[PDB]
Ligand binder design. Structure first.
Ligand SMILES: O=C1N[C@H](c2ccccc2)CO1
Ligand SMILES: [Mg+2]
Ligand SMILES: [Zn+2]
Ligand SMILES: [Zn+2]
Ligand SMILES: [Zn+2]
Ligand SMILES: [Zn+2]
Lengths: 131, 285
């Protein structure tokens, strides 16, 4: 009974971060040791004529981004572990995340390392025009 | 090709909305087209779901610099025979709102300790994963009728994991700087470890120079077996699966070839005792 959610390619990294005290550090160290990025993310078929904002209610990918389902880009949702923010709730689950095409191979790692500009809503270093 | 790790065990006949699905596989079929997913304005997210996620299927074969391996070789386990603790878990099955996974019920150790836990699972919700009590039934059969009373005599996991750390500390403070859990068909024991074990780089005790064997969530601190009072997690434990040593039959039949002083009382701690006994006889004779 039940429906499989994962593929065998993710078993090692998911089990490693599922047991870690600091899962974010464990994932970054896993990548640094030559480990493969988490795969089986929710990649969207979209027009690519969107605003380009980082976290949206609908896919807003532009010609330089790929749109993904938010929960699938969150290490804490992927491992089924506690979220690090004090309220314990997710900011990616329930939304779509726009990831630059050059970083689309590792969406979970991209969201773990980068921040969204509170002014323009674009990723810092990847679309934020502000100073 | 799929795995049973993180298998969705809910009874809901539909999948998840693309924004709430942890994976492409779990996205509802309505949204799937040409290997990808589409957003359908007018088909909204679900804000009330509770989906039990299975913790059966972990694979601890990571190779990360600075992170010790949990599963050790037979020769390394022999060197740390003082740290050996037999471990076995008798589980219950998920029922009513979920089906398809086993939850830890009675945790047994070669120390003779048996701890009964409240059937608890990892339930995904629209906001996070809720570690909470779930409906469960003892396994179908008469060799498991001793578990029926235990369904109501369990302790919450915050209490159970404190008792495990206290028991291991009292047993191992004068014997070893480690714990080596000695297992037979490790699958369910490794699943159960997710409930009371944490891993990371090697650390030292906050009160001394001995290696850290315990962790506290409350204070974000590490402790050896001598200073772990109040600690809730087993930190960086080691383990080995005796079943994988080329034995042809079941635990009891292999244990009984060398030992006649441990009669099977059909309880978690009895299996744990038999496992450590079999490991000693196999490794040192
Ligand atoms: O309708 C469905 N059911 C499948 C599924 C897979 C995993 C978890 C939940 C649901 C995908 O589409
Ligand atoms: Mg057993
Ligand atoms: Zn999340
Ligand atoms: Zn900006
Ligand atoms: Zn100490
Ligand atoms: Zn024996």
């Amino acid at each position: 009974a039940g429906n499989a959610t994962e593929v065998p390619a993710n078993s090692t990294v998911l089990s490693f971060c599922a047991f870690a005290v600091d899962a974010a550090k464990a994932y970054k160290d896993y990548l640094a040791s030559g480990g493969q990025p988490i795969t089986n993310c929710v990649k969207m078929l979209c027009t690519h004529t969107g605003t380009g904002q980082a976290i949206t209610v609908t896919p807003e990918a532009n010609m330089d981004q790929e749109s993904f389902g938010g929960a699938s880009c969150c290490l804490y949702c992927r491992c089924h572990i506690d979220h690090p923010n004090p309220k314990g709730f997710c900011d990616l689950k329930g939304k779509y995340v726009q990831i630059p095409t050059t970083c689309a191979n590792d969406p979970v790692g991209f969201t773990l390392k980068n921040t969204v500009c509170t002014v323009c809503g674009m990723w810092k270093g990847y679309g934020c025009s502000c100073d | 090709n799929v795995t049973g790790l993180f298998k969705d065990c809910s009874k809901v006949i539909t999948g998840l909305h693309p924004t709430q699905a942890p994976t492409h596989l779990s996205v509802d079929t309505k949204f799937k087209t040409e290997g990808l997913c589409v957003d359908i304005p007018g088909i909204p997210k679900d804000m009330t779901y509770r989906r039990l996620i299975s913790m059966m299927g972990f694979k601890m074969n990571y190779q990360v610099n600075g992170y010790p391996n949990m599963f050790i070789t037979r020769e390394e386990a022999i060197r740390h025979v003082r740290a050996w603790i037999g471990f076995d878990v008798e589980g219950c099955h998920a029922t009513r709102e979920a089906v398809g996974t086993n939850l830890p019920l009675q945790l047994g150790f070669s120390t003779g300790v048996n701890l009964v836990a409240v059937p608890t699972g990892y339930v995904d919700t629209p906001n996070n994963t809720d570690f909470s009590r779930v409906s469960a039934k003892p396994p179908p059969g008469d060799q498991f009728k001793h578990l029926i009373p235990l369904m109501y005599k369990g302790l919450p996991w915050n209490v159970v994991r404190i008792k495990i750390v206290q028991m291991l500390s009292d047993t191992l403070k004068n014997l070893s700087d480690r714990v080596v859990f000695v297992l037979w068909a490790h699958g369910f024991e490794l699943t159960s470890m997710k409930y009371f074990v944490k891993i990371g780089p090697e650390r030292t005790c906050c009160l001394c120079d001995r290696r850290a064997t315990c962790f506290s969530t409350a204070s974000d601190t590490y402790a050896c077996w001598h200073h772990s009072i109040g600690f809730d997690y087993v930190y960086n434990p080691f383990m080995i699966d005796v079943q994988q040593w080329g034995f042809t039959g079941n635990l009891q039949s292999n244990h009984d070839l060398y030992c006649q002083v441990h009669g099977n009382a059909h309880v978690a701690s009895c299996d744990a005792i038999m496992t450590r006994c079999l490991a000693v006889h196999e490794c040192f004779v």
